[PDB]
Amino acid sequence: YGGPPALQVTQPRVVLASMKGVASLACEYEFTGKAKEIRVTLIRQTGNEFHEVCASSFTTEYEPFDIECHVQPSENNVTLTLMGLKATDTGLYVCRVELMYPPPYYMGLGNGTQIYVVE
């Protein structure tokens, strides 16, 4: 149990690239609260070797109210748009989510326990 606390990350099992060389892919992750920083990485698994295909970091800010990659975070969800794919880019792509500085305080209440006491 040496590693970092795990994130449950889910990823479409298959995606078809358009004929234009564009693919979309959503990386969903289970987490409550917004961490101050997120980094998202797409790792290509070519057989035995792994190499980074894209990677974007984001921090929480005030906002008005070969393979190139667009990353759009969202509540528990990151859409990755790959462009400039060629035939040889076909293969397995693993999504990685990293969260840093989670909320510093969590709270929950239970639904209550009726305790019956008898003399």
Ligand X SMILES: CC(=O)N[C@@H]1[C@@H](O)[C@H](O)[C@@H](CO)O[C@H]1O
Q: From the annotation, which residues make up the binding site for N-acetyl-D-glucosamine? A: 28, 77
Binders of its own copies among residues 33 to 72 (CB under 8 A) are 33, 35, 45
In angstroms, what is the minimal distance from the CB of 26 to ligand X? 4
Quote the CA–CA distance of 89 and 67 in Å, as a whole number: 8
81: contact with ligand X by CB under 6 A: no
111: contact with ligand X by CB under 6 A: yes
Q: Which residues are annotated as a binding site?
A: 28, 77
The answer to whether 57 and 118 are in contact (CB under 8 A) is no
**Residue 62 token pair:** 């005030």
Q: Which residues contact 17 (CB under 8 A, 6 or more apart)?
A: 23, 82, 85, 89
72: contact with ligand X by CB under 6 A: no
Binds ligand X by CB under 6 A, chosen from 26, 35, 67, 99: 26
Centroid of chain to Cα 105: 22
Cβ proximity to ligand X, 3 vs 112, nearer residue = 112
Q: Which residue has the tokens 């974007």?
A: 56
